[PDB]
Write an enzyme that holds these catalytic residues in place. Sequence first.
Site, mmCIF file in Angstrom:
data_model
loop_
_atom_site.group_PDB
_atom_site.id
_atom_site.type_symbol
_atom_site.label_atom_id
_atom_site.label_comp_id
_atom_site.label_asym_id
_atom_site.label_seq_id
_atom_site.Cartn_x
_atom_site.Cartn_y
_atom_site.Cartn_z
ATOM 1 C CG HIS A 41 20.608 6.593 -7.694
ATOM 2 N ND1 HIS A 41 21.335 7.782 -7.800
ATOM 3 C CD2 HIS A 41 19.331 6.944 -7.412
ATOM 4 C CE1 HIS A 41 20.471 8.798 -7.668
ATOM 5 N NE2 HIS A 41 19.235 8.300 -7.462
ATOM 6 C CD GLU A 72 24.932 7.346 -9.201
ATOM 7 O OE1 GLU A 72 25.853 6.485 -9.073
ATOM 8 O OE2 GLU A 72 23.720 7.100 -8.958
ATOM 9 N N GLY A 146 13.216 13.141 -4.899
ATOM 10 C CA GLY A 146 12.355 13.558 -6.016
ATOM 11 C C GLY A 146 13.100 14.374 -7.069
ATOM 12 C CB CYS A 148 17.774 11.693 -8.323
ATOM 13 S SG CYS A 148 18.581 11.957 -6.715
#
Length: 182
Positions: A41, A72, A146, A148
């Site tokens: 992402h 991911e 904050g 990730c």
Amino acid sequence: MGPGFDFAQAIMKKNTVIARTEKGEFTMLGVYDRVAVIPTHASVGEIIYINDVETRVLDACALRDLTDTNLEITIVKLDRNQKFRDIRHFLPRCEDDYNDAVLSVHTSKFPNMYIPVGQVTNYGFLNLGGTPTHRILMYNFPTRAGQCGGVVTTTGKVIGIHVGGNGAQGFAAMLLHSYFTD
Ligand SMILES: O=C(O)c1ccnn1C1CCOCC1
């Protein structure tokens, strides 16, 4: 403060950079040579900022399992003039559960941050922001925006990168040794 924090600090001090994309600032784990990982992402493009330096992206691959399901994890090769310490021997070979993990984050918003998250479950399937995702680890800590890209470690293993949460639980994508064979 104790031996889990020792291993986490050793990884943060040599194998992380601050990565910036158009989607934000992220903790980025360097794994070997000029190869690093970041949550998918982050939407890595042709150019990324690394410690506030404009850096060409030589390759970016958003990993999916053999069922064509999101994992991911994006593996990025950076046009950087310096290699990372090779930490591939700290990566697990198989999907597993863990005791006593630490989540470590280093950004402008959260410098030198370390969180003892406790027990880590092999959760498996998660609907992450609407996207079916596999190989998810879960911990019962109220993680926030904050974090990730944050690195999840035990003593002696680098097991995942933080990718999300639901307000009460946090979720990491597994790192496996087989992602970084060359
Ligand atoms: O950066 C390191 O090698 C480091 C710091 C603390 N512990 N380690 C290693 C030592 C060998 O077993 C796996 C962990």
